[PDB]
């Protein structure tokens, strides 16, 4: 069974501007491990596959987190360190393109549909249970876990919001934008690591190391 209550409890239990952004990403990587342990059946998987899933989705998992957190603000994002990075601050630092993509494709769309924390956790659970991750000892088991998550999500949507029959599909159609924004974010992190002008902490550095 995959109850949406535990998924929501997992979210509620864990909840130069580029330098401030990288420090917040490192802090949330420690928090991401605690979040994944509270997702049902994740800890029961082999320990090697838990590494594979977290190393493959940490980028999209953390991006979905602060994008939904940034619903409160209108022209910026809310870092987990309590700091706010404004539109113009990211633009003045030369990273306004990906910042605008986060605001228009993710934050504003999350604000438009009033995506609740249960729907956010179910989407992050779907990202976590990625059966296409290379090296999985049993990708069909991870695929079965993903199916139980969006089954509980569709039931939650048709029960909590029965007046919106297309809300379930509208939630899943943000994952392609989450995937593309995540890949562009990895390019930025690799570029700053290659040049070495931005300090990158240990956990964030470990996630950028090659498999």
């Amino acid at each position: 069974d995959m109850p949406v209550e535990r998924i929501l409890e997992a979210e509620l239990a864990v909840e130069d501007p580029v330098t401030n952004i990288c420090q917040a990403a490192d802090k949330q990587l420690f928090t991401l491990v605690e979040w994944a342990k509270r997702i049902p059946h994740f800890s029961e998987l082999p320990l090697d596959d838990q590494v594979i899933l977290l190393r493959a989705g940490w980028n999209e998992l953390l991006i979905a987190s602060f994008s939904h957190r940034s619903i409160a603000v209108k022209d910026g994002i809310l870092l987990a360190t309590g700091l706010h990075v404004h539109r113009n601050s990211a633009h003045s630092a030369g990273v306004g393109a990906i910042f605008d993509r986060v605001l228009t494709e993710l934050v504003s769309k999350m604000r438009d549909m009033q995506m609740d924390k249960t729907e956010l956790g179910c989407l992050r659970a779907i990202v976590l249970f990625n059966p296409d991750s290379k090296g999985l000892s049993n990708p069909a088991e991870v695929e079965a876990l993903r199916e139980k998550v969006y089954a509980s999500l569709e039931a939650y949507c048709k029960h909590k919001y029965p007046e919106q029959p297309g809300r379930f599909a509208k939630l899943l159609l943000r994952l392609p934008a989450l995937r593309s924004i995540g890949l562009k974010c990895l390019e930025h992190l690799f570029f700053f690591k290659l040049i070495g002008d931005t300090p990158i902490d240990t956990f964030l550095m470990e996630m950028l190391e090659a498999p």
Binding site: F30, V33, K37, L47, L54, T202
Partner: peptide
Amino acid sequence: HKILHRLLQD
């Protein structure tokens, strides 16, 4: 992947 391994076992 030393940091991720140590946090998952605890």
